[PDB]
Each structure stands twice: as structure tokens, then as C-alpha cells.
Amino acid sequence: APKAVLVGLPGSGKSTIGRRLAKALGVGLLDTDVAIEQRTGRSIADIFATDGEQEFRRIEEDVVRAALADHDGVLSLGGGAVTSPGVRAALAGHTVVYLEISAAEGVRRTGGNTVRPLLAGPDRAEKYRALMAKRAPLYRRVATMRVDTNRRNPGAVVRHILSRLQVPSPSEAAT
Ligand SMILES: O=C(O)C1=C[C@@H](O)[C@@H](O)[C@H](O)C1
Numbered sequence: 001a002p003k004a005v006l007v008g009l010p011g012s013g014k015s016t017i018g019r020r021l022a023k024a025l026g027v028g029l030l031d032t033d034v035a036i037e038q039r040t041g042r043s044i045a046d047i048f049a050t051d052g053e054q055e056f057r058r059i060e061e062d063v064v065r066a067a068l069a070d071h072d073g074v075l076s077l078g079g080g081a082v083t084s085p086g087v088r089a090a091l092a093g094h095t096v097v098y099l100e101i102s103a104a105e106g107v108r109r110t111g112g113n114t115v116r117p118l119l120a121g122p123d124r125a126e127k128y129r130a131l132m133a134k135r136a137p138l139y140r141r142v143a144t145m146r147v148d149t150n151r152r153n154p155g156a157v158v159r160h161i162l163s164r165l166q167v168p169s170p171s172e173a174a175t
């Protein structure tokens, strides 16, 4: 079972944090969005467009359940997986790290490299805020470790997690 399952919104640093955490632990990194494409040979968008949302979610849940069973390292969950009741059920009992950010912080961090993100109009930021209002309550439900990542360097976030994922040395009996 995974050392840590990472959840959060775009802008939470989830990709970078996952890689860095896996590097520090020396464990494998499995991203469920990548795994779905590797197992189907179809892009995320293609699946949505042809089989529909519900079928994408069923495929994703199968992938997530298999990873929870078989993967020992860091598991990075796609951003909509927790909308599936079966995924929230399957997570119970796992170590689930929620990289928590505010709506304002998320909007800032998903603006990209343009200097004047406001000039493109409010629609993208409004859709982001809507997404956070829907997703954040579900991430708080499934979390076992909430980590405030607002204005923190990704290395500090990794240290915070590592200090709360320590494993004692085994006894003689265990060895
Ligand atoms: O927010 C979502 O529901 C999604 C997030 C991505 O990680 C992908 O799993 C896909 O684009 C759906």
C-alpha cells in the first residue's frame, strides 16, 4: 500500500511535491492519470468524449483500486477521482496527504507565465474557484494529513510530510 496518496487542486504543487517526496523516500511514483492512458492506450480527453464521464470514472476507479492494492510508493491521484464514491471508500485506511491551498493562492499559481492574467477575462479564474468549492470538501473528507502549502517552498512541504511519515527501526523479532 502506498507510503502516501497525494491529493489536491491544480496549483497545489501536487506534481512537483510527488516527485520530490518519492525522491526523498526512494520510492516509486505512480500518477493515476498517466496510468489510465497507459492501460487504455487512449487519452483522457478521448475517453471522456467517446465513452463519457461515468465510464472514465469507472476506469479511473479500477486503476486507483489496483494502485492502492499493489503500489508501495507515492500515489498521485487525478483531480476528479475523489468525486467517485467508490474511490473515497477505497482510500479509507490509507495515508492520504492533502496539499491544501486557498482559492486565491490557486488562482495565482495557475495563471501561467503571462504578466497580466486579469486581462484575459475572469472566466478561467471563476471556473477554478468553482472547482475548488466542489473538490476541497471531498479532499478534507478523505485526508489523513492536511498540509498548508500556501506560500511555502515545495522543499519545506516535503520536509513537513517526511517528519510525519517516519518509520521506526524494526525490532529483532520482526527481522
Ligand atoms: O478535475 C478533474 O476531474 C480531472 C483532473 C485531471 O487530473 C484528470 O484526471 C482529468 O482531466 C479529470
Ligand SMILES: [Cl-]
Pocket (backbone or CB within 6 Å): 020, 021, 024, 154, 155, 158
Ligand atoms: Cl525536496
